[PDB]
Design an enzyme around this catalytic site. Structure first.
Site, mmCIF file in Angstrom:
data_model
loop_
_atom_site.group_PDB
_atom_site.id
_atom_site.type_symbol
_atom_site.label_atom_id
_atom_site.label_comp_id
_atom_site.label_asym_id
_atom_site.label_seq_id
_atom_site.Cartn_x
_atom_site.Cartn_y
_atom_site.Cartn_z
ATOM 1 N N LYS A 99 51.363 -6.325 -11.105
ATOM 2 C CA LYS A 99 50.403 -5.227 -11.118
ATOM 3 C C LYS A 99 50.516 -4.278 -9.923
ATOM 4 O O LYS A 99 49.910 -3.204 -9.922
ATOM 5 C CB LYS A 99 48.989 -5.809 -11.202
ATOM 6 C CG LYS A 99 48.772 -6.687 -12.428
ATOM 7 C CD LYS A 99 48.933 -5.906 -13.731
ATOM 8 C CE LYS A 99 48.626 -6.761 -14.939
ATOM 9 N NZ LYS A 99 48.538 -5.945 -16.166
ATOM 10 N N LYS B 151 52.658 1.422 -10.457
ATOM 11 C CA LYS B 151 53.683 0.445 -10.834
ATOM 12 C C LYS B 151 55.066 1.102 -10.933
ATOM 13 O O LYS B 151 56.081 0.526 -10.516
ATOM 14 C CB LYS B 151 53.333 -0.228 -12.167
ATOM 15 C CG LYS B 151 52.137 -1.142 -12.088
ATOM 16 C CD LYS B 151 51.685 -1.627 -13.466
ATOM 17 C CE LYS B 151 50.238 -2.126 -13.441
ATOM 18 N NZ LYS B 151 49.275 -1.173 -14.038
ATOM 19 N N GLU C 265 53.635 -0.520 -22.067
ATOM 20 C CA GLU C 265 53.443 0.306 -23.259
ATOM 21 C C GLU C 265 52.455 1.433 -22.980
ATOM 22 O O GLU C 265 52.357 2.381 -23.760
ATOM 23 C CB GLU C 265 52.917 -0.534 -24.420
ATOM 24 C CG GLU C 265 54.006 -1.042 -25.339
ATOM 25 C CD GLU C 265 53.477 -1.945 -26.433
ATOM 26 O OE1 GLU C 265 52.234 -2.039 -26.573
ATOM 27 O OE2 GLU C 265 54.311 -2.554 -27.145
#
Ligand SMILES: Cc1cc2nc3c(=O)[nH]c(=O)nc-3n(C[C@H](O)[C@H](O)[C@H](O)COP(=O)(O)O)c2cc1C
Ligand SMILES: Cc1cc2nc3c(=O)[nH]c(=O)nc-3n(C[C@H](O)[C@H](O)[C@H](O)COP(=O)(O)O)c2cc1C
Lengths: 216, 216
Positions: A13, A73, A164
């Site tokens: 994360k 990220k 995604e």
């Protein structure tokens, strides 16, 4: 121990921006992308590997609107891989694949090559002519590549996270993918996690085999 | 060395039917199936692991007509995994997943649990309400699992072959999958290859990275 690897890996994360892949690791992740299996060896994929700060910034443009929560990220990882699928399976691509298998020495005769070609075209035609689902068929092969890749990078000792949550319309436009016959499916930053990676200290969770598994 | 594993694995075309995996080895392949990642940890899948003579014969009924070239792989392999996807993402399943994460200790507060549910539902709703592609979205997660699995079993020292060349209507009927909420996607026989597996010694072939890969 691959079972250890599968149990110890997690979706990162937050990445340590000071920690980059070695040159060897950079070569190794590309090898993983290339050598994934696919149906009929159709390899219906393109990868964008962003290693520069500019390249990563270009990818992170897709982490917008509801997807801003994935921006850091993409920015702080060492390398960010965009997995793309072909939008249509054409005969030009099928010829590239069979010609390559031939160059690699997989065919004893011109008739073995033809038979391999006809077999591959049987499956492609099932999707692109019969079912009209060749886009989704090819996308499935790319997701297979992704699963291979995540286990692979973990086995290399690398952190990663599949994404995604990105705007594929923005990412496609940024790299002119539509005109080239591709569309972005999954973004995977790779590197080493930072102390802010909260998912490093959460237990892994999966549904019990009582629910997901049948034995006969 | 996972790169060596990646380069040395292959799609097995002939299994030694005399070489069965132990129940303990089967345990490991079930772990790999269970612990694959997936979007939102949605785990939209079911696995049939057929290891008896009759069990594998049942699966092998699906390799008929144009698919007879895959029948013997399903019969002769030790353990044959049918990868299935859910046919729709229902609210009950979503609740199952978040409750499991709770049971596994991933939420320190009720709000953390609620946030995880809300985020998951955001993605589920995007697919099932807006795009109307939740079936395809879930099938993509199952293919990711297959990719993980093929590299995993290879890293265990086991041979396998992924199979799309089967009649899924026949396989679904044989195991009553549709009325249960599932559909079969990929069959993966696992075991040990025989000396008559021609593909074990044929050179591997992939398109060069100069076609498939862009560095930025
Ligand atoms: C989704 C998928 C389905 C496949 N189906 C079959 C199949 O039905 N029969 C078969 O002999 N091989 C099948 N293969 C093996 C591929 O042809 C193989 O992955 C490819 O030629 C690359 O070689 P390696 O060896 O895996 C399948 C592979 C994938 C990824
Ligand atoms: C296809 C796919 C897409 C994912 N997308 C994201 C994402 O956009 N953001 C994120 O934080 N995690 C993402 N993940 C990580 C998943 O939440 C994670 O795989 C799952 O909860 C299981 O935990 P482990 O740890 O991977 C994604 C995973 C998959 C398989």
């Amino acid at each position: 121990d691959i079972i250890s690897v599968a149990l110890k890996r997690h979706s990162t994360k937050a990445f340590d921006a000071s920690k980059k892949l070695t040159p060897e690791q950079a070569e190794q992740i590309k090898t993983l992308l290339q050598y994934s299996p696919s149906s009929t060896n159709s390899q219906p994929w393109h990868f964008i590997v962003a290693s520069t700060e500019e390249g990563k910034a270009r990818v992170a443009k897709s982490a917008a609107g509801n997807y801003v929560f994935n921006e850091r990220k993409m920015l702080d990882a060492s390398h960010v891989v965009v997995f793309c699928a072909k939008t249509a399976m054409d005969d030009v691509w099928l010829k590239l694949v069979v010609d390559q298998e031939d160059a690699d020495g997989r065919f004893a005769t011109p008739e073995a090559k033809a038979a391999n070609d006809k077999g591959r075209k049987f499956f492609a035609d099932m999707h692109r002519k019969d079912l009209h689902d060749d886009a989704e068929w090819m996308a499935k092969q790319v997701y297979l590549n992704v699963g291979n890749f995540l286990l692979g990078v973990a086995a290399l000792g690398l952190d990663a996270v599949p994404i995604e949550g990105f705007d594929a319309a923005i990412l496609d436009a940024e790299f002119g993918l539509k005109e080239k016959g591709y569309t972005s499916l999954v973004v995977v930053p790779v590197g080493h996690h930072s102390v802010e990676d909260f998912n490093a200290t959460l237990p892994k969770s999966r549904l019990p085999q009582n629910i997901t598994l049948t034995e006969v």
